[PDB]
Amino acid sequence: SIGSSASAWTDSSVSTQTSTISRRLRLKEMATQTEGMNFDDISAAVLKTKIDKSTQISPNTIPDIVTEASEKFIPNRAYRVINNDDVFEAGIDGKFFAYKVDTFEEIPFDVQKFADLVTDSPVISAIIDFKTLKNLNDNYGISRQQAFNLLRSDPRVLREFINQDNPIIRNRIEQLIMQCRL
Amino acid sequence: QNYGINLPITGSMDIATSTLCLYYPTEAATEINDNSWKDTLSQLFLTKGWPTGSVYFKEYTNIASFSVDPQLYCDYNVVLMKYDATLQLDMSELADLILNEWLCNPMDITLYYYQQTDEANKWISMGSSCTIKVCPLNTQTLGIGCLTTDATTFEEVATAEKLVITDVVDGVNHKLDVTTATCTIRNCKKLGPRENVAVIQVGGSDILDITADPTTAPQTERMMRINWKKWWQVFYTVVDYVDQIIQVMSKRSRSLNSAAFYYRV
Amino acid sequence: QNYGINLPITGSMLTSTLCLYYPTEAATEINDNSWKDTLSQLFLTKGWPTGSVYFKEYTNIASFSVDPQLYCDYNVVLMKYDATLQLDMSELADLILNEWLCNPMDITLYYYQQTDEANKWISMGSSCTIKVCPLNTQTLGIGCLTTDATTFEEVATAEKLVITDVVDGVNHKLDVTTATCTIRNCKKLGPRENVAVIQVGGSDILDITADPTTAPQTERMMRINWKKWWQVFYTVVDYVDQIIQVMSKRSRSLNSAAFYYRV
Amino acid sequence: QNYGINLPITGSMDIATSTLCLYYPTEAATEINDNSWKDTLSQLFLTKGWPTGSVYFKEYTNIASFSVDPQLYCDYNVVLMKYDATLQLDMSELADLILNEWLCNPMDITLYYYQQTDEANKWISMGSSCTIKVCPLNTQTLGIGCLTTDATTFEEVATAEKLVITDVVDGVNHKLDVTTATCTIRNCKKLGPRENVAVIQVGGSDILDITADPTTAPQTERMMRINWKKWWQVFYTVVDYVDQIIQVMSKRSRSLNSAAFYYRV
Amino acid sequence: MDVLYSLSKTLKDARDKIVEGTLYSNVSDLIQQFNQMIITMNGNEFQTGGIGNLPIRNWNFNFGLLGTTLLNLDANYVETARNTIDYFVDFVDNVCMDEMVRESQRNGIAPQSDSLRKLSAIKFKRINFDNSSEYIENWNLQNRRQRTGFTFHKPNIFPYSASFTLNRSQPAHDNLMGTMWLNAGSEIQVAGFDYSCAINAPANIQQFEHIVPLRRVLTTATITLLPDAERFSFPRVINSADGATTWFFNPVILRPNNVEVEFLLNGQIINTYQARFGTIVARNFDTIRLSFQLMRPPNMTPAVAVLFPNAQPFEHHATVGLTLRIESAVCESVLADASETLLANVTSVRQEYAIPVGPVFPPGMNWTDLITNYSPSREDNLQRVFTVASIRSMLIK
Amino acid sequence: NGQIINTYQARFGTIVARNFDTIRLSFQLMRPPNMTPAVAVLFPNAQPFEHHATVGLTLRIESAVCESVLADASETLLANVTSVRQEYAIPVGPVFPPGMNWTDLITNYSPSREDNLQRVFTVASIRSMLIK
Amino acid sequence: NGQIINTYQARFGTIVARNFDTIRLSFQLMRPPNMTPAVAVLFPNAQPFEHHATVGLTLRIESAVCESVLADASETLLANVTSVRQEYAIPVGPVFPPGMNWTDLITNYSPSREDNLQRVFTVASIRSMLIK
């Protein structure tokens, strides 16, 4: 297979294989093996808010909306894993990148080690992917704690950035939110 | 976007439920001698892996009547024809008519004078009473074994046959005379292999020829034969091997979403 | 497979058939049989090979609507205005003017509903008369009862061709004399650009879309005026250049039929 | 000096009373039921800005009689035609005859054999009794659905119509037969848009076609429609908006001082 | 090579400073330089030309010196110096004219002309006034394996190639979805057009992308990203790709939604900008990838609602457009510019005497083909010829 | 002098001309041979028209060298001349057009006006070296 | 640069090309004019086919000289680099692709990667002169 040996998760060619790996890894969100916030939390929150605001839905209609929303929401998911000061990230759409936590230097991609480690290791939803992170590290003078928590997607620092109303984080959040539709 | 302009494809070499109709003759219905057999066969197909209510069944009175413009409205079709020791040419015509795509242009019998261009061109006539009489012509439109004004010296090629396929030598015009009130002749050009259907023969001795070409006798894998004495055995056999039958065939290439200006009928 | 249809493509900066549908009225009025030879020879002089032009006859607009059978690649059809037949005229023009994909319906037993604006119910036959009753989630008729048939609501009576629409989204129970008609559920895919309609007298009645607020006039729906059919024939033949420039030829039907069947 | 040799013009892009005739049908005169109405309308036009005695008025007995060589002798003309639900082709012919410049050359029916050259060529026949019968010919002057010596097998194209426009397919000659004692046929070639006139229709349903071209249905701005029940309302409406009517039109381009060898009639 | 630049600069400085009446104590340096140049130059002949119509000329050198006897320059001393100077100027001009035309496939960074090759000998190495000028300094620094640069204004680097790529296409062109772009000079304008106007599009949003490579790495690029492109905003009728039919284009310009501009290097992300218009700064990039989204108006008005019929009949297609301009940039290799006439000098000298096309430069010095398939040998030869051209343009104004 | 020096056919992009004083442009509008419904209708062979056909070329010179003094939009000379002139509301001179309207000056370009322009621009360039 | 330098027609065997960067191959499959029973039947003009026709060319370069550093199967450099790299399980560098997968390195051949390859191969060649 693509990993080190046979396992139930290793079963543009690099892009396609990584996309399949990410699509299968999407199910990890039901495995309680995540750190911090995750995509499904945002989906549930927006579903609750739009249920409360809406009034044109009958009690016979809730199951269909919930079933469709739990699946179709956020097709563009990203995941990143950490190994010895190195970070590998892969996207469902076909994006794949690797970078270091010190100065965010571009790192050549190795599929083998990614498949080796993602099988049994912490996984964190990549709300802040590499594009936003690099733009933030360039255009804004953040400290090491903020960046390290962002790679972990700590709610406190993310909400502090929201308070500061940084245009890049607003753009990322709004792009994520606009995708929430049937 | 727009289809039809076939942009060249480039792949690689590093990679690892629909409608199903079925026809049968009336003799099969009489031999079955049952009412709820349709439900039984549908449930058997459900067991084999098809949805219930997705397997229709039709019927034809006779091989003759089935020949009158044989339509098909299925994504997967298998036609059962009962062999008869005297209608060999009729069976060959039926197979060659329902086995290949036919692209037709209407042809008159009174004003124009029709001819043929290439070996991939044929004449198909269907009707209740088809009597086809032909006469070759020269460059000066004079008489060659038949006079244009006369009509009683034209050579018969097929009389009273419910299906008539005919072909004349390329490079010469020919005049026609046929009852338009009972038969219709259409100028048709053969496109290629129509994979939407298969033919299963009961009894028989490998009679069908799918082309007028002498030197070739292509025994297609879609042409398959069995033997029978009670129709229920044949029905069970054809139901049992559904996987092989569907694997042999494929989707009707002319019915996919690539239809746009692909010379679809 | 794909030469460039819907897939990336890079640019830079004779034997074709021609049919002609004519009503019996023209032939009866002109009262001749040699006119076919005259028209063929005129076409030859214009530059089209002889015998490449077909001619077909229809007794009436109602009869011609019964399962139309296209017989060429390019097509021009003629129709005459009627005092109280504009519905059939427009419906026939729309039907033979756009491509259709129809799923056969077992109307007798089950129920049906459409799915979107691009869905319609098409019915043809010798004598068709449809009656429908809308349903609810309780399976009881609205303004009707599910058992009796007389108390239903008329949509069409004794009509040869019916093109109808309902409130798309809710099931409905229909009824018809099936032994004298046929009903098929169809979806309008796109423009069938190999057929044009020429009006002979009238005031541009045709509408090719069930949308009430949109009713365009394309390049294949024109009008002329007549006093002797020979004038119409001569004008049509002389200006064949414009007509052949208007339509395309890549819309050939994969088989001789008006609308495809379950594809 | 001399005109006609069009020397190219060069401008820049840095810059900031005549005769008016009017026609009406007899039914309008009967419905008016007055004597001094002409003076009233002339004074109204004086109020709107035209000199008195500069607005003539004429009359035509019927749409049929108005069709007999419709002359015009005005620098500004508006023609009022009463719509009728059965003379649609007559109205179309009248509009297409009085709306475009027509350049004609006389044509015989006995000695020569006339034909057509381009799509901008037409045949116009006017007379008290116009019966037009035509017959196409081949290269060898043989018979094609009609014999030259015979005259009872020619196809009618228009009978007893006071106005007749006809066109035949380019590239073939045609022989004629028409009563010269009651009708006149003139070979004419269409020049272009004659802006000296406009057409206003009462009632109607947008029937007029200004060309034999099928694929085009040009609704000119000069073709305008109204609705009526009493003629006085229509007269008041057309008088009120004189400014718009004259602004739509323009001077007769073929009547300016540029006439010299500009192919004026 | 540096010998020629030293000669040209010394001649220009001498023509600048030796004017009537000036005090000698201000041209002592140039007097010593000129005397050394005359001492080393004499006794060695030269030959130039021999190819095409270029005039073959022979050269001699027998001149006096410029002594130190006066306190202020008089007319006669200036006249003598000027008479010598003009002759040396003609010598430099003819040597350059010989050098510019020729080329070589191999060793395309070394001198080729006989006069220049003889000049490169060691016994002439005593004349190098300075290397202050931009091109000569860059050449000298490139001689010793060091990073270089060039201050360029409107540095045309995009080859001219008008092209479009369709995405959805009817056979008769009644339902089109695709992109039109035109890369002229240093100006990129990309337009994304749709016929459906996002009425049948998935999620009512149509995705557009376009990637344009660049053969040479730039730096310090001030990028003016202005929306509402002008190259495709007017009616058009063009031939199809196969050249057997045509199509129409009736455009309406909408608001480009969520404009994404990305600059990459070596296959990684360097600098990104979302939804910013105006002027932005990029520091190091080799590939430009512009992508955005066309958004259907969520609500309309009578005219707008009529203008976008949901059904197939279409008479008004929608399009969004962007404009990419490079108003300033610094490159690592020689390129065409607009602040001088260097490429103009090369083209004029090539065409004036009709040298037959060699094995490197495509005929006529058409910049499109020259920049199309960029190869290091071609770049080196162009660098040498441009250095010689800049030498010429620093003598004749 | 009416003689052809530099010629280029279908060379869109960047071209160079060595020495010229007259520009002659010729292009041909050709009706497309084969059509499609839209263009097949929008160009009728009859009289009335809804859309006219036109082709166009944009020619821009980016850099040049002249043997005589000329103004440019890439320097600060003509602005200096007009600013100094309007500084004290001098009456219009007997040579230069009023207010240094550049179009009026370049219209009837006279050798005397050329010499005066050369002197004025040289003096302006001398002045521009100091006031920074 | 899209310009023809070396061309050879029907020269099978050994040919030499002096300086090239792009290879264009064109060949034509022609139906034989006259036939014999076997080939006369095995190529039917009808639809069904039992054997397809194909032609093919094998082009192999045996020796070449390049102006930049390139690996080869006739020396022992890339093997030295990969052996030294995997000797101590070094984390993948920010330039070279993982594990010196030669295809991955040659895919996006960058000038920086070229310079790094040159330095590494030079150092390896220095090392190979001693350990015998």
XYZ file of C-alpha atoms in Angstrom, chain B residues 15-242:
228
model
C -3.507 2.673 -11.301
C -5.107 -0.505 -9.962
C -28.689 -0.387 -11.241
C -30.671 0.388 -14.399
C -33.482 -0.951 -16.579
C -33.350 -4.519 -17.923
C -36.024 -5.612 -20.384
C -36.559 -9.116 -21.748
C -38.601 -10.479 -24.656
C -40.037 -13.924 -25.340
C -42.314 -15.577 -27.916
C -45.952 -16.472 -27.356
C -45.115 -20.185 -27.440
C -43.051 -19.639 -24.298
C -46.067 -18.019 -22.635
C -48.294 -20.965 -23.567
C -45.734 -23.508 -22.351
C -45.236 -21.671 -19.042
C -48.942 -22.047 -18.176
C -48.901 -19.801 -15.112
C -50.089 -16.382 -13.957
C -47.755 -15.185 -11.181
C -44.558 -16.238 -12.982
C -43.627 -12.580 -13.510
C -43.487 -11.991 -9.756
C -41.398 -15.141 -9.316
C -38.823 -14.063 -11.897
C -38.743 -10.521 -10.511
C -38.040 -11.866 -7.024
C -35.323 -14.139 -8.419
C -33.710 -11.097 -10.035
C -34.046 -9.313 -6.693
C -32.119 -12.182 -5.119
C -29.423 -11.947 -7.797
C -28.960 -8.228 -7.123
C -31.481 -6.168 -9.074
C -34.172 -3.862 -7.652
C -37.732 -5.127 -7.735
C -39.978 -3.521 -10.309
C -36.944 -2.690 -12.460
C -37.195 -5.759 -14.730
C -39.962 -5.293 -17.287
C -41.266 -7.949 -19.668
C -42.762 -7.571 -23.139
C -43.980 -9.970 -25.816
C -44.151 -10.377 -29.588
C -46.849 -12.309 -31.429
C -44.507 -13.913 -33.967
C -41.047 -13.562 -35.483
C -42.806 -11.948 -38.446
C -44.656 -9.314 -36.413
C -41.606 -8.676 -34.225
C -39.819 -7.663 -37.436
C -42.080 -4.633 -38.037
C -39.749 -1.821 -36.895
C -38.268 -3.506 -33.792
C -37.973 -0.793 -31.164
C -35.911 -0.996 -27.984
C -36.292 1.185 -24.882
C -33.879 -0.391 -22.410
C -30.367 0.206 -21.124
C -29.815 -3.575 -21.198
C -31.618 -5.829 -23.671
C -31.557 -9.546 -24.435
C -33.773 -10.834 -27.253
C -34.934 -14.459 -27.390
C -35.801 -15.780 -30.853
C -37.181 -19.252 -31.529
C -35.270 -20.943 -34.331
C -37.212 -22.221 -37.331
C -35.714 -24.423 -40.037
C -37.106 -22.294 -42.912
C -36.766 -18.604 -41.907
C -32.964 -18.543 -41.725
C -32.661 -15.330 -43.733
C -35.342 -13.701 -41.578
C -33.380 -14.473 -38.410
C -30.162 -13.209 -40.001
C -31.896 -9.978 -41.007
C -33.385 -9.527 -37.538
C -29.996 -9.996 -35.887
C -28.263 -7.653 -38.331
C -31.008 -5.052 -37.840
C -31.088 -5.041 -34.033
C -27.343 -5.614 -33.538
C -25.792 -2.550 -35.223
C -26.530 1.162 -35.192
C -28.374 2.196 -38.351
C -28.385 5.794 -39.602
C -31.170 6.318 -42.136
C -32.280 9.010 -44.586
C -35.734 8.817 -46.196
C -35.917 7.786 -49.846
C -38.692 8.285 -52.399
C -39.665 5.944 -55.245
C -41.119 8.409 -57.735
C -39.095 11.608 -58.199
C -35.453 10.815 -57.472
C -33.206 7.933 -58.567
C -31.235 6.423 -55.706
C -27.892 4.619 -55.702
C -25.190 3.462 -53.281
C -21.795 4.857 -52.302
C -19.785 2.433 -50.145
C -19.921 -1.104 -48.779
C -21.149 0.346 -45.464
C -24.426 1.317 -47.172
C -27.595 -0.785 -47.214
C -31.306 -0.575 -47.993
C -33.852 -1.517 -45.320
C -37.541 -1.984 -46.117
C -40.166 -2.649 -43.440
C -43.920 -2.945 -43.806
C -46.966 -5.168 -43.758
C -46.530 -6.096 -47.443
C -43.072 -5.377 -48.883
C -42.602 -6.164 -52.586
C -39.306 -4.769 -53.881
C -38.503 -4.666 -57.601
C -35.296 -3.098 -58.913
C -33.698 -2.199 -62.245
C -30.124 -1.058 -62.959
C -29.426 1.845 -65.302
C -26.645 3.068 -67.570
C -25.208 6.563 -67.907
C -27.651 7.466 -70.695
C -30.610 6.220 -68.590
C -31.384 3.608 -71.264
C -32.629 0.065 -70.620
C -30.439 -2.706 -69.212
C -32.536 -5.850 -68.978
C -35.503 -3.648 -68.028
C -37.235 -0.536 -69.347
C -37.905 2.453 -67.098
C -41.417 2.996 -68.468
C -42.144 -0.721 -68.157
C -42.592 -2.215 -64.699
C -43.223 -5.937 -65.350
C -39.605 -6.836 -66.213
C -37.973 -5.715 -62.953
C -36.145 -8.441 -61.053
C -37.603 -9.455 -57.707
C -35.208 -9.493 -54.764
C -37.699 -10.177 -51.964
C -41.471 -10.748 -51.971
C -43.954 -10.493 -49.075
C -41.122 -10.677 -46.532
C -41.827 -8.649 -43.401
C -38.144 -7.633 -43.339
C -36.045 -6.991 -46.446
C -32.362 -6.091 -46.601
C -30.834 -5.548 -50.031
C -27.671 -4.156 -51.585
C -26.685 -3.253 -55.144
C -23.279 -2.765 -56.755
C -21.671 0.612 -56.117
C -21.259 3.001 -59.021
C -24.664 2.629 -60.704
C -28.095 4.126 -60.130
C -31.215 2.010 -59.662
C -34.928 2.766 -59.871
C -37.468 1.294 -57.464
C -41.117 0.270 -57.429
C -42.804 -0.696 -54.165
C -46.224 -0.232 -52.577
C -45.835 2.872 -50.414
C -49.264 2.130 -48.915
C -47.950 -1.043 -47.243
C -44.126 -0.841 -47.144
C -41.469 1.772 -46.416
C -37.899 1.785 -47.738
C -35.244 3.886 -46.009
C -31.714 4.609 -47.241
C -29.470 3.730 -44.304
C -25.724 3.742 -43.659
C -24.221 1.375 -41.093
C -22.377 3.165 -38.293
C -20.916 0.376 -36.182
C -21.410 -2.058 -33.302
C -24.498 -1.453 -31.154
C -23.622 -3.082 -27.832
C -26.916 -2.308 -26.085
C -28.374 -5.711 -27.038
C -27.490 -9.388 -27.235
C -29.093 -12.306 -29.067
C -29.675 -15.741 -27.532
C -30.770 -18.555 -29.842
C -32.705 -21.684 -28.861
C -31.832 -24.762 -30.875
C -30.413 -23.761 -34.236
C -27.093 -24.554 -35.925
C -25.121 -21.258 -35.999
C -27.037 -19.819 -38.939
C -26.909 -16.055 -38.402
C -24.591 -13.858 -40.461
C -24.308 -10.270 -39.245
C -23.047 -8.863 -42.559
C -23.273 -9.290 -46.307
C -19.494 -9.721 -46.474
C -18.770 -13.205 -47.852
C -15.156 -13.680 -46.807
C -15.860 -12.854 -43.146
C -17.986 -14.925 -40.757
C -17.516 -13.037 -37.480
C -18.927 -15.083 -34.597
C -19.421 -12.302 -32.068
C -19.286 -13.049 -28.364
C -22.725 -11.425 -28.098
C -24.202 -14.227 -30.242
C -24.748 -17.174 -27.904
C -26.548 -20.498 -28.258
C -28.295 -22.987 -25.971
C -30.506 -26.073 -26.250
C -33.952 -26.682 -24.819
C -36.986 -28.879 -24.462
C -38.922 -27.049 -21.701
C -38.893 -23.253 -21.658
C -38.528 -23.057 -17.880
C -35.035 -24.564 -18.057
C -33.954 -21.898 -20.550
C -35.471 -19.143 -18.412
C -33.679 -20.420 -15.308
C -30.401 -20.697 -17.219
C -30.599 -17.160 -18.603
C -31.557 -15.748 -15.195
C -28.754 -17.614 -13.400
C -25.900 -16.200 -15.500
C -27.055 -12.565 -15.462
